[PDB]
Ligand binder design. Structure first.
Ligand code: BCL
Ligand SMILES: C/C=C1/c2cc3[nH]c4c(c3C)C(=O)[C@H](C(=O)OC)c4c3nc(cc4[nH]c(cc(n2)[C@@H]1C)c(C(C)=O)c4C)[C@@H](C)[C@@H]3CCC(=O)OC/C=C(\C)CCC[C@H](C)CCC[C@H](C)CCCC(C)C
Ligand SMILES: C/C=C1/c2cc3[nH]c4c(c3C)C(=O)[C@H](C(=O)OC)c4c3nc(cc4[nH]c(cc(n2)[C@@H]1C)c(C(C)=O)c4C)[C@@H](C)[C@@H]3CCC(=O)OC/C=C(\C)CCC[C@H](C)CCC[C@H](C)CCCC(C)C
Ligand SMILES: COC1=C(OC)C(=O)C(C/C=C(\C)CC/C=C(\C)CC/C=C(\C)CC/C=C(\C)CC/C=C(\C)CC/C=C(\C)CC/C=C(\C)CC/C=C(\C)CC/C=C(\C)CCC=C(C)C)=C(C)C1=O
Ligand SMILES: CCCCCCCCCCCCCCCCCC(=O)OC[C@H](COP(=O)([O-])OCC[N+](C)(C)C)OC(=O)CCCCCCCCCCCCCCCCC
Ligand SMILES: CCCCCCCCCCCCCCCCCC(=O)OC[C@H](COP(=O)([O-])OCC[N+](C)(C)C)OC(=O)CCCCCCCCCCCCCCCCC
Ligand SMILES: COC(C)(C)C/C=C/C(C)=C/C=C/C(C)=C/C=C/C(C)=C/C=C/C=C(C)/C=C/C=C(\C)CC/C=C(\C)CCC=C(C)C
Ligand SMILES: COC(C)(C)C/C=C/C(C)=C/C=C/C(C)=C/C=C/C(C)=C/C=C/C=C(C)/C=C/C=C(\C)CC/C=C(\C)CCC=C(C)C
Ligand SMILES: COC(C)(C)C/C=C/C(C)=C/C=C/C(C)=C/C=C/C(C)=C/C=C/C=C(C)/C=C/C=C(\C)CC/C=C(\C)CCC=C(C)C
Ligand SMILES: COC(C)(C)C/C=C/C(C)=C/C=C/C(C)=C/C=C/C(C)=C/C=C/C=C(C)/C=C/C=C(\C)CC/C=C(\C)CCC=C(C)C
Ligand SMILES: COC(C)(C)C/C=C/C(C)=C/C=C/C(C)=C/C=C/C(C)=C/C=C/C=C(C)/C=C/C=C(\C)CC/C=C(\C)CCC=C(C)C
Ligand SMILES: COC(C)(C)C/C=C/C(C)=C/C=C/C(C)=C/C=C/C(C)=C/C=C\C=C(C)\C=C\C=C(/C)CC/C=C(\C)CCC=C(C)C
Ligand SMILES: [Fe+2]
Lengths: 42, 307, 51, 281, 53, 53, 54, 42, 53, 40, 43, 55, 42, 55, 43
């Protein structure tokens, strides 16, 4: 559309982007788990 | 209630102008940025491209590290608190070392040592940028008027932070890095030196600072008045004197008896502003080193009623 | 009696600025909150004249 | 006494008052009705300054000081020896300034150019009238105006500035100082750029406006343009004067304490007035 | 779902730059907030725990 | 309903950018309001609860 | 009135919707702040007193 | 007609706009009703 | 009584914008005035009525 | 001047209908407040 | 009908995706509010 | 994660590495200065007290 | 491909970048481990 | 890390070397000034105290 | 590949010299740090 990306390109771009997003969130979850064990905030 | 040409009443947006290529290394030149309609009402809408060479990089790296070092000290003074950082942003300060340390670099990092590091970055940043103005003019084959107009600014900047502290033999005489601190430094400078108003050179700089406002208000209004004859294209008027140059000449000739040219008015412009800092550097340099009290100096030189 | 779109746009922005500034100065605990909200809306309103 | 091109622009008309009664040139100057008022008010103002030196008892030009009437006289007349002369000179100065602006208006109409110059000059006059007329009237004493002396009108600035602590903290002053510094920065850049484009390296051709934009785009990544910079020059100067007029008209009328005390409102904002650490608390 | 189509609307270059700036500033803002508080200022509390002062 | 036609009138790029900024600013505004109050400052709550101070 | 639809003939739907969104959000925020300003209806303060948070 | 909208388009736009308005007003009434039950202001 | 020539002489968009802002500001100021006065301050009087404070 | 007589007249009819509706609700609210708390 | 040049069917699919995100976003918000109310109710 | 190389199809490596080089150094300076700021972890002061270098 | 690089060039570019990244991370881990032994912060 | 040499296929050597020299010099000064800041490690003062150059 | 215009052999040679300088710079740095740690250790 506006960006000129094909639907296959959008799916591939989203697939790797979500792979990064879950990889980023996975470390964030582990980071929050470690902090909560070390010093809980609730 | 007519069109005063203060703001453009219509905007046209053609292709971006990539600029001349006399001797400019196009590899170091970047691409064209956006077009700002808000800027287009007043002047040109196009932003960029900007040249980035060796001195450009050194200017940015030292300029960033100077900006970064002040910021880290600003965060440390805030206790790393974003709310405190915004609350005391203007009240933060990177003070120079205490008077006891003199010019020695033995000041503790939190007691003046950091300021020396930040000041070094600014020193390299500004001098590298001055060469950048010099080399950009040389690349396009233009005159070095900007380079020497800039060197007037550096002279005052060097005096306040580097030269005068050396003569006074103390980094404490320099300028703190802060919004309100360097205002307070300014006020404390006059009070210590006895009413800096009676500095003859400070008075001259105000004359040329007032005159620069006077001359630019005069010059800006004059060209906008004769912009209906295409007078804003000053370079062509220098090359081929049109009716705008003549009317602009005649208005001031009939007003105040004398006039200038389309090229000679800009010689007044550059010298009016250069003397702002040129006389400024001498005025600050003398204070303390030569005159410890200007009002007493004013009395002995027939500027004050007493004595 | 021949105000342009930009002239009328500025006049309304001044009215909006004063009005919204008072609105959020009462709503907020400080006059600055009104100034910010009133100023931003008026600037946004005055920067978008329909034409 | 005429330039090589001045003749074809010397035509009647454009006068606001007097028609052809005063429509003539004295040397290069154009007289007009308001120039006659200009010369009279200028000459009368100058003589009374010289006569005020006689009454003061000094001839040193720097020691000459036409002090305004003391605060006890309020906004009434004063003896000529102790304030009355200043009022006459101020009236003469006001008359000379406004007549000069209106004389420029006549020259504008005769040449067919815009009235930007007299409108720019009127900003200076209102800045002048702020200090000598508008501020003293609100404060109810001519003594709050400044003396007509080279180094005694600096005493007024220093004394009025320190009445409110460090005057730097005046917020309208900070705006105007930034404008004054910016205008001088623009003028140096603008003057130097045209000269660099008009007096280039020896042998090289005179540069074009594109080189002017190319230089400042290679320098700071943006060129405001030949039209923009002269618009910028006019607006930077007028804004500096407008905020300078504003800064004084609010001082001693709306704000009375130290200006540094004013800035505590930002520190005392509800959401961070009590957070520990930093500079304030 | 079909969220991949957001890339048809949004330029990947602009979003990733905007996201990269956004994530870092968010990470910096959160870390500073914790450092501001006397609790969670992990440098301060470790010094207290081992009696560094 | 026929709410899909709102995209026939609004540019999707500008709306998403405005919505992205709006939601983040709203989320920040709410989170700061919670921290401003003596209660609901979860950082303060934990410190008093676990005796960190 | 059934003839209100003609308002869209003279007003651009894009301009109105943007104006409406800002106006509604501004109005909603202001009312919420007014409730928070008063000691009553400050639901955050109300709960703290109710559950004895101080 | 500055907008260049046809009569039918204005009617269709208005019908959708009112539909959104009633949906918005319906939620607000429910929200006000919940608050009045929780804390009446009369 | 015509009252329809005003739409012919004036821009209808300007009239509607001017009326909308003025009336909204007027209605807003009246509500603020009532909240300012101890009487008709519906928030405060209801709190006293139901024994909130 | 953009609108003709018929366009302006219909526009005015729409405006008055909205104005009467606005006034009627304003009256209803004023009556309700006076019932709850008289001022006059 | 042509303010943005977007096809009517394109608007239908764009809105369908947009509502899907809106419900997904609001679903997490409800879960977030539910946990907070359990942890610290504000009523 | 195996397709992360696709990022170089979008981002210019020259722009990224300049952006990253500035980012990494400014981050490293910020962290190092934070440690120096604290009374602890100021390793220069720590060894000075350890080795009786105060006098 | 906005950058104009082919997939094989990107695969090569990533391989060098990740090799650099792991080496940079490897030294950082040793640096954090050495500091934690010398002065733990948890 | 053999493929490292590929960095010059993308980086311009002139730009990198200028950045390299600028970076190392600015970094070297910053450390030297940091050392001179602390009363310890100030090698122009420890010798002065060692040899009693200054009373 | 085309961003610099260099070939693989030129880059290989260019890198080899650059690392030669880098190891020389690194070696002198290591000797310098050892001298400081011997004369005045900071740990
Ligand atoms: C109580 C305070 C004192 C006083 C104390 C001082 C002191 C102290 C000084 C002045 C100075 C000046 N004063 Mg005084 N002054 C007072 C009253 C006045 C009054 C007045 C009406 O009362 C006026 C009009 C002035 C006017 C002036 C100026 C003429 C002059 C500064 C020129 C300039 O541009 O400096 C500002 C410009 C510079 C310093 C040059 C900067 C150039 C460098 C290269 C810029 C680097 C940029 C940096 C890297 C940041 C980059 C940022 C990025 C681009 C984003 N003063 C009273 C009496 N004044 C100065 C001077 O020269 O006096 C003789 C000075 O040092
Ligand atoms: C004649 C005397 C006047 C004058 C003259 C001139 N002034 C010039 C030139 C001339 C002729 C240039 O050629 C040069 C330039 O290129 O202009 C576009 C320059 C500059 N005058 C600056 C600032 C300035 N001039 C001030 C005053 C006056 N100047 C007086 C009135 C004041 C104050 C306090 O009033 C300030 C703050 C910068 C914008 C710029 C240097 C950038 C720099 O050093 O970057 C190096 C510093 C950085 C890159 C730091 C960046 C920090 C983060 C990254 C952002
Ligand atoms: C608003 C933006 C700027 C601005 C603007 C413009 N400004 C203009 C123009 C524009 C555009 C013109 O077109 C006009 C002109 O033609 O220019 C050549 C003019 C002019 N700008 C003058 C001076 C000037 N501009 C200043 C400031 C700015 N200007 C600001 C910054 C300052 C200061 C202090 O900052 C000064 C001193 C004159 C040279 C000239 C008027 C001549 C006059 O009026 O003659 C008639 C007056 C005399 C011949 C003087 C003698 C007789 C009188 C009655 C004696 C009065 C005594 C006096 C009170 C004593 C005071 C003593 C003192 C020590 C306490
Ligand atoms: C043909 O007409 C046209 C002009 O040219 C003659 C124009 O100039 C312009 C260009 C002008 C704009 C785009 C913007 C103009 C709008 C304003 C003047 C904004 C008004 C500003 C205020 C109300 C000042 C108060 C605002 C404050 C202090 C809030 C901000 C505070 C913080 C963020 C802190 C346009 C569009 C134009 O159409
Ligand atoms: C207009 C001047 C604006 C800029 C002033 C800069 C400082 C000038 C003064 C200075 O440096 O003085 C000390 C210096 C040196 O002082 P000096 O002591 O060597 O000489 C002065 C002589 N006695 C002591 C008798 C006063 O003075 C000079 O160089 C003389 C400058 C005189 C300028 C006088 C202008 C008169 C204008 C007409 C009268 C208007 C009154 C109203
Ligand atoms: C402080 C603010 C001072 C502001 C002064 C503004 C003066 C503007 C004068 C405008 C004259 C316009 C006009 O038609 O006047 C007719 C008359 C003069 O008419 P005239 O007979 O000269 O003809 C004017 C028309 N021309 C020249 C083209 C043929 O104005 C006056 O009465 C003189 C102005 C009085 C000035 C007062 C000063 C005190
Ligand atoms: C004041 O408030 C406080 C601070 C107290 C609390 C905070 C409140 C708020 C407002 C918090 C806000 C949180 C938000 C908005 C968090 C959002 C997080 C998100 C959305 C993170 C997304 C992360 C995504 C990542 C890291 C993606 C990485 C992807 C890659 C590394 C691969 C990229 C490569 C691609 C796409 C290749 C392209 C493919 C082709 C085929 C060309
Ligand atoms: C200080 O005063 C206090 C705060 C105390 C009390 C307050 C007093 C006052 C004065 C309050 C003000 C109240 C007012 C004036 C409220 C006004 C409310 C309005 C006008 C609300 C309207 C809402 C309308 C909405 C939400 C409409 C939504 C529409 C949609 C969801 C669909 C839009 C999409 C369309 C039309 C698609 C386009 C169609 C086609 C065919 C392409
Ligand atoms: C002072 O007031 C306080 C702070 C006390 C309380 C606050 C009060 C107020 C005024 C609160 C305001 C709340 C509001 C107005 C909330 C509104 C929330 C909304 C409307 C959120 C919407 C979220 C929507 C999301 C997250 C949508 C996401 C969608 C996607 C990720 C998919 C997009 C992709 C598409 C459409 C692909 C394109 C498709 C095609 C076929 C081309
Ligand atoms: C305030 O917060 C504090 C400071 C207290 C705590 C800090 C918080 C935050 C916000 C921390 C943020 C951390 C982040 C975002 C860290 C990220 C680190 C990363 C991504 C590091 C990456 C390193 C990569 C390196 C060193 C790679 C080097 C690669 C080379 C030297 C080789 C380059 C050559 C190539 C690619 C050749 C190209 C090949 C071909 C075939 C063209
Ligand atoms: C605030 O933080 C403090 C200051 C306390 C502590 C500081 C911490 C930080 C952030 C430290 C940062 C350290 C870093 C990042 C250091 C990096 C050092 C590096 C990468 C140094 C590299 C040096 C390389 C050199 C000297 C190489 C020189 C090479 C030559 C002279 C030969 C080049 C010649 C060639 C390529 C020939 C040309 C080839 C052809 C085919 C024509
Ligand atoms: C969140 O924000 C971050 C941290 C990301 C970045 C923010 C940074 C901030 C907030 C920066 C703020 C900067 C400010 C407020 C700067 C203000 C500067 C001012 C007002 C300066 C005024 C005057 C300064 C002067 C005149 C300085 C002159 C300096 C020199 C002439 C250099 C002197 C050179 C020396 C001492 C060399 C000494 C060193 C050796 C090795 C001999
Ligand atoms: Fe010019």
């Amino acid at each position: 559309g506006y960006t000129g990306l094909t639907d296959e390109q959008a799916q591939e771009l989203h697939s790797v982007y979500m792979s990064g997003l879950w990889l980023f969130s996975a470390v964030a979850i582990v980071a929050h788990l470690a902090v909560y064990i070390w010093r809980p905030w609730f | 209630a007519e069109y005063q040409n203060i703001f453009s009443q219509v905007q046209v947006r053609g292709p971006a102008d990539l600029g001349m290529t006399e001797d400019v290394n196009l590899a170091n030149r970047s691409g064209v940025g956006p077009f700002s309609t808000l800027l287009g009402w007043f002047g040109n809408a196009q932003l960029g491209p900007i040249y980035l060479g060796s001195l450009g990089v050194l200017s940015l790296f030292s300029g960033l590290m100077w900006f970064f070092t002040i910021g880290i000290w600003f965060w440390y003074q805030a206790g790393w608190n974003p709310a405190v950082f915004l609350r005391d942003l203007f009240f933060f300060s990177l003070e120079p070392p205490a008077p006891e340390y003199g010019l020695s670099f033995a000041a503790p990092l939190k007691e003046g040592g950091l300021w020396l590091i930040a000041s070094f970055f600014m020193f390299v940043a500004v001098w590298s940028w001055w060469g950048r103005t010099y080399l950009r003019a040389q690349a396009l084959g233009m005159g070095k008027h900007t380079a020497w107009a800039f060197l007037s600014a550096i002279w005052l900047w060097m005096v306040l932070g580097f030269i005068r502290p050396i003569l006074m033999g103390s980094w404490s005489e320099a300028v703190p890095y802060g919004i309100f601190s360097h205002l307070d430094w300014t006020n404390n400078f006059s009070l210590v030196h006895g009413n800096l108003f009676y500095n003859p050179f400070h008075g001259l700089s105000i004359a040329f600072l007032y005159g620069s406002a006077l001359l630019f208000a005069m010059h800006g209004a004059t060209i906008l008045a004769v912009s209906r004859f295409g007078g804003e294209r000053e370079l062509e008027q220098i090359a081929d004197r049109g009716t705008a140059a003549e009317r602009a000449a005649l208005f001031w000739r009939w007003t105040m008896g004398f006039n200038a040219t389309m090229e000679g008015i800009h010689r007044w412009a550059i010298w009016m502003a250069v003397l702002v800092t040129l006389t400024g550097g001498i005025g600050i340099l003398l204070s303390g080193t030569v005159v410890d009290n200007w009002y007493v100096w004013g009395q002995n030189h027939g500027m004050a009623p007493l004595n | 009696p021949e105000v342009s779109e930009f002239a009328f746009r500025l006049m309304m922005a001044a009215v909006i600025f004063v009005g919204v500034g008072i609105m959020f100065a009462f709503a907020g605990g400080h006059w600055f909150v009104g100034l910010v909200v009133g100023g931003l809306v008026a600037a946004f309103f005055a920067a978008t004249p329909n034409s | 006494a005429l330039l090589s091109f001045e003749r074809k622009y010397r035509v009647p008309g454009g006068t606001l008052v007097g028609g052809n009664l005063f429509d003539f040139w004295v040397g290069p100057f154009y007289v007009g009705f308001f120039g006659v008022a200009t010369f009279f008010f200028a000459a009368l103002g100058i003589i009374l300054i010289a006569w005020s030196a006689v009454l003061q008892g000094t001839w040193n030009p720097q020691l000459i000081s036409v002090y305004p009437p003391a605060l006890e006289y309020g906004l009434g007349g004063a003896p000529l020896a102790k304030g009355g002369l200043w009022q006459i000179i101020t009236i003469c100065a006001t008359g000379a300034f406004v007549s000069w602006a209106l004389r420029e208006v006549e020259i504008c109409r005769k040449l067919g150019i815009g009235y930007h110059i007299p409108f720019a000059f009127a900003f200076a006059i209102l800045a002048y009238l702020t200090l000598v007329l508008f501020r003293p009237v609100m404060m109810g004493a001519w003594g709050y105006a400044f003396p007509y002396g080279i180094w005694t009108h600096l005493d007024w600035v220093s004394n009025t500035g320190y009445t409110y602590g460090n005057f730097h903290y005046n917020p309208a002053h900070m705006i105007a100082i930034s404008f004054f510094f910016t205008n001088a920065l623009a003028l140096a850049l603008h003057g130097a750029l045209v000269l660099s484009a008009a007096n280039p390296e020896k042998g090289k051709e005179m540069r074009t406006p594109d080189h002017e934009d190319t230089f400042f785009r290679d320098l700071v990544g943006y060129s405001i343009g030949t039209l923009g910079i002269h618009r910028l020059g006019l607006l930077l100067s007028l804004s500096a004067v407008f905020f300078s007029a504003l800064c004084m008209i609010i001082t001693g009328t709306i704000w009375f304490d130290q200006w540094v005390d004013w800035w505590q409102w930002w520190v005392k904002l509800p959401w961070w007035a009590n957070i520990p650490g930093g500079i304030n608390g | 779902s079909k969220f991949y189509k957001i890339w048809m609307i949004f330029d990947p270059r602009r979003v990733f730059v905007a996201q990269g700036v956004f994530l870092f500033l968010l990470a910096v803002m959160i870390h500073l907030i914790l450092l501001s508080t006397p609790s969670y200022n992990w440098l301060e509390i470790s010094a207290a725990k081992y009696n560094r002062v």
